[PDB]
Amino acid sequence: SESIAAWYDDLQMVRGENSPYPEYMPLPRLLGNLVLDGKMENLPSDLIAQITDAALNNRVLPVSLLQAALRRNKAEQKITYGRASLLKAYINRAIRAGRLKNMKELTMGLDRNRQD
């Protein structure tokens, strides 16, 4: 579990009370925040088939999440938990891989700091 734990701990994101979002958010429903409108068109080679490999193995989430999650952020004009959480996972693992050098890893909570 140390790779799925790290997947669901890099993916941890804030939830209020009675948040309709699961504590650990399912990958298909998580990747469904990257998809056009429903999770089947998320690219079965750099995405659903590679996020899972980047999740099952604690590898670095592909840039195609920033790219896709950002695409949906400004395309759905909102950041669903699942795009915030998935971006938190990407950026946390980009930091941890030294792929995002200066930045420091995100936390669950709002960082009333972070200067970024």
Partner DNA sequence: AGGAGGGCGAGGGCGATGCCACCTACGGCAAGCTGACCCTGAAGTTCATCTGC
Instruction: With beta carbons less than 8 A apart as the criterion, state whether 86 and 69 touch.
Output: yes
Q: Does 46 bind DNA (CB under 7 A)?
A: yes
Is residue 45 part of the contact set for DNA (CB under 7 A)? yes
Contact 65, 73 (CB under 8 A): no
Does residue 105 interact with DNA by CB under 7 A?
no
CB 39, CB 31: distance < 8 Å: yes
Judged by CB under 7 A, which stretch of 2-10, 67-75, 79-87, 106-114 contacts DNA?
67-75
Taking the complex as a whole, how short is the minimal distance between the CB of residue 12 and DNA, in angstroms? 26
Q: Which DSSP letter does residue 111 get?
A: -
Interface ranges with DNA (CB under 7 A)? 36-37, 41, 43-46, 72, 74-77
